[PDB]
Amino acid sequence: NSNICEVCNKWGRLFCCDTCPRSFHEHCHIPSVEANKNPWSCIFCRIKTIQERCPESQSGHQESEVLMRQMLPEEQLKCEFLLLKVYCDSKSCFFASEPYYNREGSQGPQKPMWLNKVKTSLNEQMYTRVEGFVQDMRLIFHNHKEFYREDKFTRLGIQVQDIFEKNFRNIFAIQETS
Ligand SMILES: [Zn+2]
Ligand SMILES: [Zn+2]
Ligand SMILES: [Zn+2]
């Protein structure tokens, strides 16, 4: 197995996947690494299994279809995996914890959002459709763009949003377009 966490790339108390060489801190993995379970497979392995079991799930989809899907266990998992892929980028640190807003010339957002809040919402099964989770995730970046205006810091928001979007189109097999 790997000697560092797949998500945050640091050593520590690691749990090891039994079906691949990745390792994880307990609360870096989403969901949190499970108490017993031997063997234990990580979320990367669980997602590969879905695809191997139904090869056709990789054929192109419309985003409008995907967003209306109810959060059954497979959609749940996929949103969990998407949230994790955003946390794998070190610039996610800017969006993890509850922000605050006191900048000359800007007002705070009406609806603050952050990664940890979405992680809790996922954990507590608060989303009934994929739409819910995708809306909260895209709001994080939209809030940021609006607040930071022409400060160059806005770019972080565009950066992490791009990672969110690429993984969204990968995980949910959105039909490729020009
Ligand atoms: Zn970690
Ligand atoms: Zn694995
Ligand atoms: Zn099938």
149 and 163 in a single domain? The answer is yes
Query: How far does the centroid of ligand 2 lie from the alpha carbon of residue 94, in Å?
Result: 27
Task: Report whether 89 contacts 163 (CB < 8 A).
Answer: yes
Question: Where does a domain end: 9, 36, 59?
Answer: 59
29 and 99 in a single domain? The answer is no
Task: Report whether 87 contacts 115 (CB < 8 A).
Answer: yes
Domain that includes residue 70, residue range: 60-178
Quote the CA–CA distance of 11 and 41 in Å, as a whole number: 19
Query: How far does the centroid of ligand 1 lie from the alpha carbon of residue 162, in Å?
Result: 22
Query: How far does the centroid of ligand 2 lie from the alpha carbon of residue 41, in Å?
Result: 5
122 and 35 in a single domain? The answer is no
Query: How far does the centroid of ligand 2 lie from the alpha carbon of residue 154, in Å?
Result: 35
Query: How far does the centroid of ligand 1 lie from the alpha carbon of residue 63, in Å?
Result: 31
Give the 3-state secondary structure of the chain: CCCCECCCCCCCCCEECCCCCCEECCCCCCCCCCCCCCCCCCHHHHHHHHHHHCHHHHCCECHHHHHCCECCHHHHHHHHHHHHHHHCCHHHHHHHCCCCCCCCCCCCCCCCCCHHHHHHHHHCCCCCEHHHHHHHHHHHHHHHHHHHCCCCCHHHHHHHHHHHHHHHHHHCCECCCC
Resolution, given in Å to one decimal, reads 1.8
Give the torsion sign (CA, 166, 167, 172, 173). positive
Q: Which amino acid is at 107?
A: Q
Tell which residue, 123, 75, 95, 87, has the closest CA to residue 6. 87
144 and 175 in a single domain? The answer is yes
Query: How far does the centroid of ligand 2 lie from the alpha carbon of residue 98, in Å?
Result: 30
Query: How far does the centroid of ligand 3 lie from the alpha carbon of residue 53, in Å?
Result: 6
The alpha carbon of residue 175 and the mean position of all alpha carbons in its chain are separated, in whole angstroms, by 20
Quote the CA–CA distance of 44 and 177 in Å, as a whole number: 26
Give the 3-state secondary structure of 76-120: HHHHHHHHHHHHCCHHHHHHHCCCCCCCCCCCCCCCCCCHHHHHH
150 and 177 in a single domain? The answer is yes
157 and 105 in a single domain? The answer is yes
Say which residues have a Cβ less than 8 Å from residue 102's Cβ, sequence separation at least 6: none
The residues whose Cβ lies within 5 A of ligand 3, an ion, are 54
CATH classification of the domain holding 150: 1.20.920.10
Ligand nearest to the CA of 59: 3
30 and 66 in a single domain? The answer is no
CATH classification of the domain holding 23: 3.30.40.10
Query: How far does the centroid of ligand 3 lie from the alpha carbon of residue 51, in Å?
Result: 9
Say which residues have a Cβ less than 8 Å from residue 104's Cβ, sequence separation at least 6: none
Please list the residues that pair with 16 across neighbouring strands.
Answer: 23
As for how many domains the chain has, the answer is 2
Task: Report whether 141 contacts 164 (CB < 8 A).
Answer: yes
173 and 104 in a single domain? The answer is yes
Quote the CA–CA distance of 66 and 70 in Å, as a whole number: 9
Ligand nearest to the CA of 24: 1
Query: How far does the centroid of ligand 3 lie from the alpha carbon of residue 60, in Å?
Result: 15
Phi, psi values for residue 118, rounded to 5°: -70, -30
Question: Where does a domain end: 14, 38, 59?
Answer: 59
Ligand nearest to the CA of 55: 3
Query: How far does the centroid of ligand 2 lie from the alpha carbon of residue 156, in Å?
Result: 30
Give the torsion sign (CA, 120, 125, 126, 127). positive
Task: Report whether 42 contacts 67 (CB < 8 A).
Answer: no
Quote the CA–CA distance of 112 and 98 in Å, as a whole number: 8
18 and 3 in a single domain? The answer is yes
